[PDB]
Amino acid sequence: LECHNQQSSQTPTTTGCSGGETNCYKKRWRDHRGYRTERGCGCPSVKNGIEINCCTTDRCNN
């Protein structure tokens, strides 16, 4: 279980999940004054048009 955390490019870090958590997520969106991005732990959260990708194959945030 190992995932990295590159909050909005900026700087990529390394933070895996634990305590009953083992799911990586890759969500991002850009709207009128509302662009954000997060890729740490998650999975449930999808819609239409935004960008979302869940993974859990040990180091799958590339």
UniProtKB/Swiss-Prot annotation:
One of its GO terms (molecular function) is acetylcholine receptor inhibitor activity. Disulfide bonds join 3-24, 17-41, 43-54, 55-60. Expressed by the venom gland. The record marks 33, 36 as: May be critical for toxicity. It is found in: Secreted. Keywords: Acetylcholine receptor inhibiting toxin, Disulfide bond, Ion channel impairing toxin, Neurotoxin, Pharmaceutical, Postsynaptic neurotoxin, Secreted, Signal, Toxin. The keyword Heme does not apply. It comes from the Eukaryota. Binds to muscle nicotinic acetylcholine receptor (nAChR) and inhibit acetylcholine from binding to the receptor, thereby impairing neuromuscular transmission. Has a higher toxicity than cobrotoxin-b. In vivo, when tested on rat arthritis models, shows anti-inflammation and immunosuppression effects. Belongs to the three-finger toxin family. Short-chain subfamily. Type I alpha-neurotoxin sub-subfamily. This is Cobrotoxin. It comes from Naja atra. The chain holds residues 22 to 83 of 83 of the full protein.
